[PDB]
Amino acid sequence: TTALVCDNGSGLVKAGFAGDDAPRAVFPSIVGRPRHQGVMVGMGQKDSYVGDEAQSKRGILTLKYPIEHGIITNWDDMEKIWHHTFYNELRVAPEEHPTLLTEAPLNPKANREKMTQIMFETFNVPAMYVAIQAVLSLYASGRTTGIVLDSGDGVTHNVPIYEGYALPHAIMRLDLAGRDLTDYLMKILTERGYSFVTTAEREIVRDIKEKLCYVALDFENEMATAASSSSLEKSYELPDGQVITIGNERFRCPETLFQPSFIGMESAGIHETTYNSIMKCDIDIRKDLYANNVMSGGTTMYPGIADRMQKEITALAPSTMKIKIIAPPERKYSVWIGGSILASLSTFQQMWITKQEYDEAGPSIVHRKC
Amino acid sequence: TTALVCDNGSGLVKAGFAGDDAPRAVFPSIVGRPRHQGVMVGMGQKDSYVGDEAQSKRGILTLKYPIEHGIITNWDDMEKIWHHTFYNELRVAPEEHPTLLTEAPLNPKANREKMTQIMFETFNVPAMYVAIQAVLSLYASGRTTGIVLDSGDGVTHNVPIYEGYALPHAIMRLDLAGRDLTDYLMKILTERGYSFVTTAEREIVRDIKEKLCYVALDFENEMATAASSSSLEKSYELPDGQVITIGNERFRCPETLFQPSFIGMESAGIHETTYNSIMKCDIDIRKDLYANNVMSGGTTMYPGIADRMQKEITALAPSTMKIKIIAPPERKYSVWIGGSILASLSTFQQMWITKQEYDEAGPSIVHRKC
Amino acid sequence: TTALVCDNGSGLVKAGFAGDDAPRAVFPSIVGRPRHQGVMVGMGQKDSYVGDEAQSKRGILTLKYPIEHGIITNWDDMEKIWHHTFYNELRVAPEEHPTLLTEAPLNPKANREKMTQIMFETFNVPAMYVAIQAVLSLYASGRTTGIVLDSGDGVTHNVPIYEGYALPHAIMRLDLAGRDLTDYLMKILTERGYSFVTTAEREIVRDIKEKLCYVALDFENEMATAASSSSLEKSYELPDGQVITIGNERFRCPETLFQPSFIGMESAGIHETTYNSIMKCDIDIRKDLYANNVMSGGTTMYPGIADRMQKEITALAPSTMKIKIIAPPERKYSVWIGGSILASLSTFQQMWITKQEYDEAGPSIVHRKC
Ligand SMILES: Nc1ncnc2c1ncn2[C@@H]1O[C@H](COP(=O)(O)OP(=O)(O)O)[C@@H](O)[C@H]1O
Ligand SMILES: Nc1ncnc2c1ncn2[C@@H]1O[C@H](COP(=O)(O)OP(=O)(O)O)[C@@H](O)[C@H]1O
Ligand SMILES: Nc1ncnc2c1ncn2[C@@H]1O[C@H](COP(=O)(O)OP(=O)(O)O)[C@@H](O)[C@H]1O
Ligand SMILES: [Mg+2]
Ligand SMILES: [Mg+2]
Ligand SMILES: [Mg+2]
């Protein structure tokens, strides 16, 4: 009778059971299909690969992400992803496990309705629920009041909560996250002569970004430092043994979070978005929001991002405001951890969307229960 | 109901039954016709000789190869060859044996279509199939990943397969193989005063090449070694008792595979062709191609060719790539062995081109079934 | 005091003086070196040939292209090319002529820096400038708004400009162009029995492609038409008098621009790349980009390419968008014509990189002036 927690991000699936501290399985949410011709008979050559097996065979596949900026764009591939999650990774039967799902705020309603319908009809779950990922990150923190910035592969969002009450008019959503940083790193890696163009070579660039990239405390000083000397240059070995070297692409890629105009966007950086979200809240709750800046997600995992956020929000806010950025070492899984905490609570047990409620009230049950 | 496997190379016919480990018969694919005048009545003096009987009587015949660089140029002589194979060597009736045939990649389509037509009309086979020889060579080695370098009398070709998927854009074909090496050995044997000019004397030079020639690990060092001393000189006894001696023609002949400019070709050597074929494949599959270099065919049978290929590809590839050359002792028949393995599989039984498909869909069935 | 305009493409050099309507000289950017042995004394047998003289003597040379996908890979041969351009074709002294050079977008920075250094040190130009070829193509058409699809021997690129402002985040670059089409035509010409393998025979195949190839309005219909009848077959006479015939290779070769998977690439066709470039631009500027599709370069010179681009972009775009493809009859020289127009303007005269700026600011002047 244990509940399931599935955190469907744009880039990774974090799935497990409620009551744990880490997910069962964490695998990329990709579906790969062969793009060359098979010449050997049989071999169990399947027509599509999901998750880690698609990354294993990615040299002969075309990798597709069913989720795009927090929105599911391919629903057959997403059913493939969910079937993989339930049967090959969790190795469970979804007929007896309530499933907690997550979603970004300010998302299309059809996304939520269709997840509800697929859970209740394709996978026959007894109950389900869709929770906002930033509220779950606050549950993982253990703090009732915080402003949460969640940055994932697809979306960056700010949700300010005070005493357990959210201020939905102050919620920010920015469609700039890890995948845009990967694409920008590809583009600026072309400057040194490195050409990554295929979907399989997007994973190599994502690995380069996760290993070698960091957030500069002061961008212009680091640009001058990289110009003067090669102290910031690091090498990376490609899957075929070729070695690439990057000097200032290491901090130019994550700078797009603070200067979105690098990729041609008109928006403000994550620091200015956070400050604007705080300033749309009530004046009496702003001090507690300044002191509680919870960062979650994999795009907040850069070395130096918390210090840079500290510096920028301190510059924006008054001098008597006491700015703290809470960046737990496990913030790459804060949404899943908070979802496990929430699904394990006794008070939450009356808040599931039951199967009978779905049957006798339609998929639109999800907008008024969640 | 057993299937036939006929490997028609430019130089030799390898024919047998599926399920065996070696072909029934291996004979030269030559048709000899007398060039002098008959003076004795009768004797069963036939107008043409095929296979081993043409080599037996080659002193009074003009030997012709119906296949030239993997392409059948004389179709009447090729029907003679196939009739010999079926009736005098296999001693079977082709009306009840499906026949698996082999062909080099990047070959004229008319070649394949006309083999299909002759099999289905002249020999009345119940079914047939044309397979690429490098895929068959990969079947024999028992693996589904690797780049195959197949060298025969007529063509040398590279086909990279990964997980059973071929990359047809990375397939190389080089029209330099054993027959070009035989001709070059004739030409450079003229340097010591030995004149072989006739088609029958081409077989003597081919025998010299198969017995005395080897691949030098370092060409310039071996050239210096042969210049300094006579330690590399070996003798060969001609059919009439004359003894010839060759010192550096032993490794100068096979060096044409690595330096095609010896015979006036502009192409790259087999090592550089293999490296170029690997580098036209996806970056994620290159490590497994480096570690799996399958060599098949009779022109890869030189002493020291695998070590030289190891050395050259190691020089071309990065230092962290782990280069292996797989050169089985039976690689002179890898194509036939793999064809037997393929024709014996149960999954392949639905992939034959049946007689009815040919009748009601034309000879062009072979491009979309094979 | 007239300025020079040198359009260095991967395949051809277009050089001339600013203010003209056509370049002085258009010759292949190849350097040929003899591959056989000289037996006649003297003759002025030079060790290397550049341009038209290499194509004249290509039967005894190995032709090398110093530019490869818009990137200069051999710099000594490129200095040979530039010296030829300046002294044997333009017959000028570069010490008193500012030189305008062109480059593809998303190119290595070392390419631009080394062209700047060689111009300012080897050829002693008073000033120089490197311009993006698509902006120059937009100069030639006399408009300041439109998305340019420039296809050359080495690179195909999309650059959307609106009101004179470029959107660098929407710039596409595809490393598929005329040379890849020539190689594909060689590969599929092997199907009818025609074997072109040498670098000199690459020019014959390029001539065949330029004379006999066209873009099919509907590929499958043309494939059916070529299968049914021989109405699409045309003959071509080789330099030695042999006549070759091609039926569907005529439109199968240029189809690789719309189906890059023909040569094993994962990218999208030029139509889908153009649509994707338009859709990464602001919603308010998309109507003017749809109506202004400037095509330039020699690979856009196929019969029927503009109509096919019209059809495909119309299929992709909404029905109320008004799609025009602007394909001037002189679009093979749009980059050079636009460069001449730009170098002749009075406003541009303050935008040269002067010699003193180079001397006292390094070769890195080119990234912040251009
Ligand atoms: N150590 C790291 N440094 C920088 N970026 C990272 C790191 N680890 C993961 N990422 C990025 O975070 C993204 C995945 O974060 P995640 O929270 O799983 O997103 P989602 O919730 O959308 O799945 C990926 O795009 C990856 O590039
Ligand atoms: N031991 C050997 N050493 C060198 N060359 C050999 C040897 N044995 C055979 N060959 C060459 O290999 C060629 C035959 O190889 P094979 O694989 O039968 O070619 P094909 O498939 O074209 O018939 C002949 O030209 C012969 O000269
Ligand atoms: N009439 C034509 N039809 C098709 N292709 C052509 C034609 N004329 C030239 N080309 C191709 O265009 C390329 C040269 O175009 P160009 O604009 O000069 O390129 P670059 O700017 O790279 O020199 C050559 O590869 C040639 O094959
Ligand atoms: Mg997330
Ligand atoms: Mg063979
Ligand atoms: Mg050009």
Q: What is the resolution of this structure in A?
A: 2.7
- The position carrying tokens 């006309």 is B114
Question: Residue B67: nearest ligand to its CA?
Answer: 2
**How far is it, in rounded angstroms, from Cα C49 to Cα A123?**
71
Indicate whether C3 and C130 sit together in one domain: yes
Indicate whether A121 and A93 sit together in one domain: yes
| Alpha carbon distances (Å) from B325 to B163, B218, C68 | 18, 17, 32
Indicate whether A102 and A163 sit together in one domain: no
Nearest to B286 among A41, A198, A240 (CB): A240
Helix locations, A122-269, DSSP H: 133-141, 178-189, 199-212, 219-228, 249-252
Residue to mutate, A332, A333, A337, ligand 1, most ligand atoms under 8 Å from C-beta = A332
**A240, B161: Cβ pair inside 8 Å?**
no
Strand order in C25-28's β-sheet?
Answer: C25-28, C12-17, C4-8, C99-103, C127-132, C353-354
Torsion of the alpha carbons at B203, B208, B211 and B212, rounded to the nearest 10: -160
- The DSSP 8-state label assigned to residue C158 in this structure reads E
C-beta pairs of C76-82 under 8 Å, 24+ apart in sequence: C77/C31, C78/C8, C78/C118, C79/C118, C79/C122, C80/C31, C80/C48, C80/C50, C81/C8, C81/C13, C81/C29, C81/C31, C81/C50, C81/C51, C82/C6, C82/C118, C82/C122, C82/C123
Dihedral (CA of A169, A173, A174, A175) sign: negative
Residue B173: domain span: 135-181+271-333
Torsion of the alpha carbons at B315, B317, B320 and B322, rounded to the nearest 10: -90
Indicate whether B1 and B127 sit together in one domain: yes
CATH number reported for the structural domain that contains residue A242 in this entry: 3.90.640.10
Indicate whether C216 and C265 sit together in one domain: yes
Indicate whether C21 and C98 sit together in one domain: yes
- The position carrying tokens 């915080």 is A146
Indicate whether C290 and C142 sit together in one domain: yes
What φ, ψ does residue C154 adopt, rounded to 5°? Answer: -100, -40
What φ, ψ does residue C129 adopt, rounded to 5°? Answer: -160, 145
Quick check: C300 and C193 in contact, CB under 8 A? no
Tally of residues, chain B: 370
How many structural domains is chain C composed of?
4
- The position carrying tokens 């708004």 is C145
Indicate whether B8 and B153 sit together in one domain: no
State the CB neighbour count (10 A cutoff) for residue C251: 25
Indicate whether C155 and C222 sit together in one domain: no
Ligand 3, pocket residues at CB < 6 Å = C 9-12, 152-154, 178-179, 182, 206, 209-210, 297-299, 301-302, 332
Residue ending a domain, choose from B45, B68, B91:
B68
Nearest to B166 among A36, A45, A58 (CB): A36
What φ, ψ does residue C147 adopt, rounded to 5°? Answer: -100, 125
Indicate whether C122 and C84 sit together in one domain: yes
Residue ending a domain, choose from B227, B248, B270:
B270
Nearest to A39 among B164, B282, B320 (CB): B164
- Of C67, C135, C92, which is closest to residue C351 (Cα–Cα)? C135
The identity of residue B204, as a single letter, is: I
**How far is it, in rounded angstroms, from Cα C200 to Cα C32?**
10
Strands B293-296 and B325-326: parallel
- The DSSP 8-state label assigned to residue C84 in this structure reads I
**How far is it, in rounded angstroms, from Cα A160 to Cα A171?**
7
Which numbered atom of ligand 3 lies nearest the CA of C296? 17
Helix, coil or strand: residue B331? helix
Plot region of C241 (φ>0 → left; ψ -120 to 50 → alpha; else → beta): left
What are the chain A neighbours of B351 within 8 Å (beta carbons)?
Answer: 41
CATH number reported for the structural domain that contains residue C342 in this entry: 3.30.420.40
Indicate whether C9 and C73 sit together in one domain: yes
Burial A74-83 (b: 16+ CB within 10 A, else e): eeebbebbbe
The identity of residue A148, as a single letter, is: V
**d(CA A289, nearest CA chain C) in Å:** 35
Give the list of residues 6+ apart from residue C50 with CB closer than 8 angstroms, or none.
Answer: C30, C31, C32, C80, C81, C84, C88
What are the chain C neighbours of A264 within 8 Å (beta carbons)?
Answer: 167-170, 280
**Bridge partner list, A350:** none
CATH number reported for the structural domain that contains residue B38 in this entry: 2.30.36.70
Q: Does C168 touch chain A (CB under 8 A)?
A: yes
Question: Residue C178: nearest ligand to its CA?
Answer: 3
Give the list of residues 6+ apart from residue C207 with CB closer than 8 angstroms, or none.
Answer: none
Q: Does B276 touch chain C (CB under 8 A)?
A: no
Torsion of the alpha carbons at A34, A39, A40 and A46, rounded to the nearest 10: 20
Residue ending a domain, choose from B253, B270, B287:
B270
State the CB neighbour count (10 A cutoff) for residue C291: 16
Burial A341-361 (b: 16+ CB within 10 A, else e): bbbbeeebeeebbbbeebeee
Indicate whether B95 and B143 sit together in one domain: no
Residue to mutate, B10, B12, B136, B176, ligand 2, most ligand atoms under 8 Å from C-beta = B12
State the CB neighbour count (10 A cutoff) for residue C152: 27
- Of B242, B176, B255, B151, which is closest to residue B204 (Cα–Cα)? B242
